[PDB]
């Protein structure tokens, strides 16, 4: 079988190039700048995914810069990077060699939805909690992902380990420096992005996380639509018409537009009757118009919906140990350093 070698730099650690050999390459998806490959590292047998992005001559690649700085059990790990030619003539491509994870939250959710079954609530708790940890960690550096959606939540279904991936839109937000509004994918965009705001904060990720939670509870996206106006109608049907004060907090250029006049649908009627009330209560504090009224990621981790995860005897339904849930660092806890009394339960200290 064909072995390929390349000179590549480790994603973490010494800025020191190494010979890297890999084999068994195969196409597993497509990217903006070429197909995505699986490969097997010859030295360890470990599976990686290799994706290509365009190298700009003018400035360092932001995704690589961010991914060299991150080290967290719920974020996909950058193993190596190297440059190559690619699909388009004359271009130089950055190749990111990431630890391979075989499934996503989206695949598991569609598997249950197609079967007209609800994802067991223990998995909803595990997946959302790990998502909020990954957000707490990146937000503690000032980094907003800007493209949270179920397809970017890699999943090992047997261990329930979740890893956030795709940092191609991620940015360190700086108050007073504008940001493009056109990030974040259909169905998951916060209303301030639908309105074209350039002055938003990392709370756009919490809105998107709320959309993922609601989708796991409902079995379908909560705010679908192919245009912003169709998405907004679905938002208003649930949250009710935003007030002028709320619109000023999202994008004050929009305060005087004539929005559909709709009373909020009660949150208890949004979801099916047997939906756990704490899940509805959490969703109601994530899907809020006023961006500063949304929970922060660490506050969401400490929400009572996640209390079952903090029980000394909780197990996966397949009998396994839960994955790592309490290895918080100072960095990850820093937005509220005295928090933890909830987050690290007694048996984890």
């Amino acid at each position: 079988s064909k072995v390929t070698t390349v000179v590549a730099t480790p994603g973490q650690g010494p800025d020191r190039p190494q010979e890297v050999s890999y084999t068994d390459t195969k196409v597993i998806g497509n990217g903006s700048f070429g197909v995505v490959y699986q490969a097997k590292l010859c030295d360890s047998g470990e599976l990686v995914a290799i994706k290509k992005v365009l190298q700009d001559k003018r400035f360092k690649n932001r995704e690589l810069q961010i991914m060299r700085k991150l080290d967290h059990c719920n974020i996909v790990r950058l193993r190596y990077f190297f440059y190559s030619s690619g699909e388009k003539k004359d271009e130089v491509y950055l190749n990111l060699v990431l630890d391979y994870v075989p499934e996503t939250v989206y695949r598991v959710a569609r598997h249950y939805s197609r079967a007209k079954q609800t994802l067991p609530v223990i998995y909803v708790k595990l997946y959302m909690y790990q998502l909020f940890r990954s957000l707490a960690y990146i937000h503690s550096f000032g980094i907003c992902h800007r493209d949270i959606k179920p397809q970017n939540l890699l999943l090992d279904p047997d261990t329930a380990v979740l890893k956030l991936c795709d940092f191609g839109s991620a940015k360190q937000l700086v108050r007073g420096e504008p940001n493009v509004s056109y990030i974040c994918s259909r169905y998951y965009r916060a209303p301030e992005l639908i309105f074209g705001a350039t002055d938003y904060t990392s709370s756009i990720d919490v809105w998107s996380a709320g959309c993922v939670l609601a989708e796991l509870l409902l079995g379908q996206p909560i705010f679908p639509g192919d245009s912003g106006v169709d998405q907004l109608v679905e938002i208003i049907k649930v949250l009710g018409t935003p007030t002028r004060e709320q619109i000023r907090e999202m994008n004050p250029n929009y305060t005087e537009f004539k929005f559909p006049q709709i009373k909020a649908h009660p949150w208890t009627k949004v979801f099916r009757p047997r939906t756990p009330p704490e899940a509805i209560a959490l969703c109601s504090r994530l899907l809020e118009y006023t961006p500063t009224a949304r929970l922060t990621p660490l506050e969401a981790c400490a929400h009572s919906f996640f209390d079952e995860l903090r029980d000394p005897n909780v197990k996966l339904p397949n009998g396994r140990d839960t994955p790592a849930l309490f290895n918080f660092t100072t960095q990850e806890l820093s937005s509220n350093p005295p928090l933890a009394t909830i987050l690290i339960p007694p048996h984890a200290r």
Binding site: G29, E103, Y106, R107, Q151, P157
Partner: peptide, 10 residues
């Protein structure tokens, strides 16, 4: 729409 071509759930 899916990240990967293959899935154990496909």
């Amino acid at each position: 729409d899916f990240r990967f071509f293959y899935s154990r759930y496909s």
